[PDB]
């Protein structure tokens, strides 16, 4: 996936995969935690192993798409309304300026 | 807890902590971050700014930047990109607001030329001259005098006229002037490697040193270019006397300010070791030589390139004879009637030179009266520390550290042998001294690999660390004091708005002297601390 | 990063099978919160089994939003989509 | 472009790539014997034009990076002698589905 | 000590029956808590002579084969005896 | 939550009160229906907005702009005249710039007769 | 009044991992820990005023409140403290990092010792957008190592050398670090070494028992020395050293301890006092509560008395104690423990980096591996007349196995009743939760009845386990993609879990001791999820082979092989009762013409099995099929169709009527693609 | 009084799906706003209009829909210097707390521009002038100048009033001020 | 709690868990590993994301910028466990809605 045969075993698993949570979820937890925090990795919240820790809704799978309902209403009634409070009193200051 | 000291506002911010408040204490506003972020991360690009600061893009970016330019608060570099066009990356001027950070002390630099008119409107004149200068920083007698009334004798309204030159005062900013030094050396490192007429491809030394020679001697006339330029100094129009060149704007001359205050120190330290007669003699003698001595300026080249453990001395040697001989022509041989308050026979009275002995001066042309110079200022610098810790912390720390000077990496028995009092105190003073820098530590493995209590504990000077910690001092009030100045603004900020435009209430009357003489305490308290800081920041 | 015109649809018009998943489950929890059902409901109950009965009739008034990896969005209504 | 014979001194590598506008290509003589491209295993790689690349990104609406890569100085890549950010369309012919292709970039 | 938010019954009954192991009062039917959260699995002249004092104490104690528990009585007494300075003036035995 | 525009359209009450008599007429229409908590504002809405007009009209709003565009009232008193200070005497000049001095007599007087058209 | 209050539902974007500043630590903490250990024993058992355990820092058992946030074990999440620590003490978690952060900086003026263009070169390499993680690290190495070859710093003018991580890894005193002047190149003129021999010259002279006898020590950097040395790192490089700076955390200073934050009390749970007066302690609090000890030692020591020599071992011993505090690493190299020692070498002094590390260590098995409520466990037993896509869940667990329900509309006329039974009998519920969300209502008190007469629409009742509900089901050692399979749950008597044997092969359950893991979900969308996705019928094929894992085994195979067998026959009766017993009732049927005629009448197995596929007219299962089963004897090569063979032959079927051959695994036995069921599905 | 363009999201529970969309929208809008006071603008009167209804995006955890629109609603911030009806209310002497019935009590006009000739007498009179006192509940023309918005919600665990969120101030700068029959 | 006897709870191991991912069930994880597992709401602060309690962000003391959200209590546990040790996995947040 990146440049070469690598990965699997922890030592190659630092390749692209950027999520410090799961990199600790496998092997060499500690030095990934610290050594991470030192280098101040900006990280991201993405993978399964990621998103179950923080416990929010999974990215892929069932959650691979948002669900939406339509309001099903016409913009005809979205038109504004007034008696034009502004417009009638406009022309007072329009003189001598 | 409970914020009363507020270590936040303090403890965790080295160095730039001063700067970002200074500019803040100056501007803040839009202008705050750009210097802060700059000195923080270093080299920075216009486009590169707003991807960090969120600083009102390409306006306050441009605005604050040209602001600093006008006031020369930045170091400024542009070059073509490697593909083409042109790119501009930016640094921060010297210590920048360092200029502002003296100000009133730079106002004191006038007190040298306070002479020739004492306590005159001329004083107030040159005053508004200088601060108007320093607010903008680059002006012309064409621009200034232009703004000034044209109905007050030209050679007087602006009375400082020929006196514009002197030693300090102003020099036109040109090119390199606020251009970053460290690189512009490398810019000169071109044209020598870059101009090699395909001579021989061997021993880059012949390529280097020669280029270095060029790089050296070319750089000389480079920095000697601002040192003096006649077209300013020389101009004498018709029916007139010699004037500056009114045309180009000139800018505050920081060198003779350095040499001046450093002088003032020497007045104090020498004044400590000698008598006010011999002292004031030394004082008035230095008034001439402080003209010629770089004294902080020599680094320059040292800054910006790796030394070489030999070639480092190949720089040092240049500092050995430099002022001593050729500027020695400008230096003390026979000087005549400096001031006098003494009277009657002035000659052997002037032989009071020889009263100079230790630990400085007292080297002359074996039968003319002369003080060593370019050798003087350097080994002078090494001595300057001395007193710096006594009521700083404790009397006893002196003698031990002083002893720690002469001996080196000994130990406590040989201390307590040499030293006195009691281990009860000896540890305290030492331990309370080790709590920061000074002694450092030395230890060696004793009948083990390395173990906790077996080995021996030794002590060392390392003024490298010492002379380089007194910045922690900078981090104290020069850090803080500026805040409680600023923090006290928002106290009266409402009144500050009103009270400033008034010329009312009893507490107002009270808090006038409170906040104001309070400002005396802070500002004066600062300059107090500054006179101490005048050293370890530079030499 | 906005709505794609209905005229152009790059997608498979069939179900996702996680379509069936979230469409059903969502519609169910809606039923559990007492929302009006769109179908004749036989003598039985519970949200899930009657929701199944709804998608049999394809009466769900919902649209699966779909994220292309570039953030180019997407829209499919149930009634648009085919089993 | 020139090849070594049997020794590749690191002094030659200290500055290998002098001239920026041109470039260099290095190999060992013994190293190059039968062309890797024509061997068997390496299927055919196709260098693709800049406009072709940007067009490919128009297709999949992909920003840069985020692609299978090729480590610079890959011998096969060296056989084609790529440069930075250059993309190859590699045609794998394997009997599973059949002949088809994918892409890689030179990192 | 705790009282219901509604019925305000002063007595709570714990239900271990179904292995919810909850707590609710016969006055309401509104539980007190969910899943009671449970657990599982220096040098001073006085203190040192308390070390030695336990050493002597226990040793010579069950030299008689006296019950271990009873020894801790005297251990307090001995400690109590330390308070009034009755201990120092004479032999330890 | 988020505000696109705070100072947007300066709006006094003309039929706005009657508009709340509309949505009110739409929802539950007060206690006059005898012949959601929302009524809390409704009483407060109709509270003052009703009395000073007595101690109303529609087309008067159109009659509002007719001679009133002629003055320097800006929008401030120009809108304020609709309700407060029944355009009389010192009331009307107590606010806006130069309703006296520069332009005074006919300008302050027409306010008295024009307000008699509505209030 | 009534200030407008808004909320937004949120979610995480990434995590920034930095270190706290000095101040930010205490900026969090409520109290100084300080004091001493003792748990201030008077008036009480560890009333623990101030000290390590503090009631305002947190709570331990359920008695008292947290002061800071009262509401005790229920509502208080704990709070952090702040340990003032005499002298700067080093830090092990950054140790191997700290050797690097110091590695590229001189000991003299302490400036980043690579410089000029090349500095900017690396810089401009990094900030390019396309630069990434592996590039972050690898590059930071390519810049890091580039420092070592520099012998001399720049505007300091002084040289330096490499630091080796002194001694080995025994960790005892090993955390001390050493570099030195190096590369004498024979004898050279080095003002460092020049002075150096001009230095020892006097102390050599004074104590000549020692110097050359123990020599070649180089020199260290003390954690006190190095805190200084860090502070004059000037802004700038930062990310060059690998640390991103923009006035938040605090440049490379923090990474050595100054104020150790007290771990919040809940994460320092005081173990049950477990009767008597002596409460079972908790470890880390013992550790730091000694760290206070040695702390105030070196704070009152070094303040007036003691000595430089009696000093350090307390202090180095301290950094061994905090390093020991956050990790195991160096364990007890005959170093012995402190106050409350023992010294028969109690093994597991370790409390911490462990508790986060392996196996039962949280961050795998106690967090990603959470042991989850609402479940059940039992042994198994076969139930063939139970349909596939169920599990028989015994009533006795259904009584305690509950499901959350939000009553609505259609629900009442069931749910209003389902209460009247109560928790005792099965078709009932126990817990009730009203629309007013007070706490919850457990069937204990009494009532119901007039209670159920209330029942707001928005209410909540927790049902028991009713007929044909949603369930998901497991076996202990997760093999592959069939680990969990939902079921419509049907309740039956006795006590055990009972599934349909044909689904054993995914679980490879031998019955016997096998103990399954029974789950019920709670939230709705998860139900329709599991059943209508993860469910049996949908997963009826196992993915890897693209094959129908679930099918008949053993009996059902061999049983088929008997009814399928050619030598069999059946009459009007026998076939009738069979076709009955095949689907217990419930179905109309049709009888194909009898396999034979005027010599009576009969039907063969091939037919009666044919109806098993297509029992009726209205049966939408028109099938053709053919294949080899196993135990196939090829005919004479003359006969071209292998359909006619010595033993049976190709199973072959057309229009869902068996033509020839016994079935026997093969077609119905998984194990292949060509299949009865796989063709069907 | 006036109008403002503001945006927000509303959670629509499933129930109201039977009811009109936009109407139930408005319903929950006033349920959220109505009388409620909105900081650094001035109090919301009620919804005026509504616009940009968009297809609602729900969350997985719930299933009850969410719709973020914007709209222009009626707020109350007339202008600084002004004269308006109201009356003294709970008060002592210096300054008076003027109010209109049912709206809010926060209007308090201190006394600076209020006529220097005055006298207070702890009994029905705030200040009497050379022209006299004034009455509670009375229609009273008074001037306002400033309103200052405050959060004042530093909820502390140790803490367990001062709600001057939208509060108006002024004085009596001319005649007819504080009592309407002085003018008129 | 642990196993049989004392009282119940059953073991979703990692190797056991991930079997659900092959079916890719979003919510089944949540209800299973979250809503029925450790039901908790952390309160945090957008500015300098950190985990307060009730209405405070503590170290930055505001009692305003807090957002309430639900998280596995094992998560916050792991945090404080970290932030006990010097480290900062500051949680920055953002809306679910408006894209
Ligand atoms: Zn109760
Ligand atoms: Zn608390
Ligand atoms: Zn250096
Ligand atoms: Zn915060």
From Swiss-Prot, chain A:
Stretches assigned to coiled coil: none
Assembly with partners or alone: Component of the RNA polymerase III (Pol III) complex consisting of 17 subunits.
Miscellaneous comment: Present with 6020 molecules/cell in log phase SD medium.
Whole-protein residues included: 1364 to 1460 of 1460
Its job: DNA-dependent RNA polymerase catalyzes the transcription of DNA into RNA using the four ribonucleoside triphosphates as substrates. Largest and catalytic core component of RNA polymerase III which synthesizes small RNAs, such as 5S rRNA and tRNAs. Forms the polymerase active center together with the second largest subunit. A single-stranded DNA template strand of the promoter is positioned within the central active site cleft of Pol III.
Intracellular or extracellular location(s): Nucleus
Protein name: DNA-directed RNA polymerase III subunit RPC1
Source organism (scientific name): Saccharomyces cerevisiae (strain ATCC 204508 / S288c)
Entry's family note: Belongs to the RNA polymerase beta' chain family.
Curated annotation (Swiss-Prot), chain B:
Key words, A-Z: Cytoplasm, DNA-directed RNA polymerase, Nucleus, Phosphoprotein, Transcription, Zinc
Annotated localization: Cytoplasm; Nucleus
Alphabetical GO biological process terms: termination of RNA polymerase III transcription; transcription by RNA polymerase III; transcription initiation at RNA polymerase III promoter; tRNA transcription by RNA polymerase III
Superkingdom of the organism of origin: Eukaryota
Gene3D superfamilies linked: Winged helix-like DNA-binding domain superfamily/Winged helix DNA-binding domain
MF (Gene Ontology): single-stranded DNA binding
One Pfam family from the record: HTH_9
Region (Leucine-zipper): 474-495
GO CC term (a single one): RNA polymerase III complex
Note: Present with 2520 molecules/cell in log phase SD medium.
Function field: DNA-dependent RNA polymerase catalyzes the transcription of DNA into RNA using the four ribonucleoside triphosphates as substrates. Specific core component of RNA polymerase III which synthesizes small RNAs, such as 5S rRNA and tRNAs.
Summary of subunit composition and partner proteins: Component of the RNA polymerase III (Pol III) complex consisting of 17 subunits.
Family: Belongs to the eukaryotic RPC3/POLR3C RNA polymerase subunit family.
Name by which UniProt lists this protein: DNA-directed RNA polymerase III subunit RPC3
UniProt organism field: Saccharomyces cerevisiae (strain ATCC 204508 / S288c) (Baker's yeast)
Gene that encodes the chain: RPC82
Curated annotation (Swiss-Prot), chain D:
Localisation: Nucleus
Family in the record: Belongs to the archaeal Rpo5/eukaryotic RPB5 RNA polymerase subunit family.
Job description of the protein: DNA-dependent RNA polymerases catalyze the transcription of DNA into RNA using the four ribonucleoside triphosphates as substrates. Common component of RNA polymerases I, II and III which synthesize ribosomal RNA precursors, mRNA precursors and many functional non-coding RNAs, and small RNAs, such as 5S rRNA and tRNAs, respectively. Pol II is the central component of the basal RNA polymerase II transcription machinery. RNA polymerase complexes are composed of mobile elements that move relative to each other.
Subunit details: Component of the RNA polymerase I (Pol I), RNA polymerase II (Pol II) and RNA polymerase III (Pol III) complexes. Component of the RNA polymerase I (Pol I) complex consisting of 14 subunits: RPA135, RPA190, RPC40, RPA14, RPB5, RPO26, RPA43, RPB8, RPA12, RPB10, RPC19, RPC10, RPA49 and RPA34. The complex is composed of a horseshoe-shaped core containing ten subunits (RPA135, RPA190, RPB5, RPO26, RPB8, RPB10, RPC10, RPA12, RPC19 and RPC40) where RPA135 and RPA190 form the DNA-binding cleft.
UniProt protein name: DNA-directed RNA polymerases I, II, and III subunit RPABC1
UniProtKB/Swiss-Prot annotation, chain F:
Any one of the GO CC terms: RNA polymerase III complex
Matches recorded under Pfam families: RNA_pol_Rpb4
UniProt entry keywords in alphabetical sequence: DNA-directed RNA polymerase, Nucleus, Phosphoprotein, Transcription
Miscellaneous comment as given in the Swiss-Prot or TrEMBL entry: Present with 2930 molecules/cell in log phase SD medium.
Coiled-coil residues: none
Family designation: Belongs to the eukaryotic RPC9 RNA polymerase subunit family.
Protein name in the entry: DNA-directed RNA polymerase III subunit RPC9
GO biological process: termination of RNA polymerase III transcription; transcription by RNA polymerase III; transcription initiation at RNA polymerase III promoter; tRNA transcription by RNA polymerase III
Subunit structure of this chain's protein: Component of the RNA polymerase III (Pol III) complex consisting of 17 subunits. Forms a Pol III subcomplex with RPC25/RPC8. Interacts with BURF1/TDS4.
Function (record text): DNA-dependent RNA polymerase catalyzes the transcription of DNA into RNA using the four ribonucleoside triphosphates as substrates. Specific peripheric component of RNA polymerase III which synthesizes small RNAs, such as 5S rRNA and tRNAs. The RPC25/RPC8-RPC17/RPC9 subcomplex may bind Pol III transcripts emerging from the adjacent exit pore during elongation.
GO molecular function: nucleotide binding
Main location: nucleus
Localization, UniProt: Nucleus
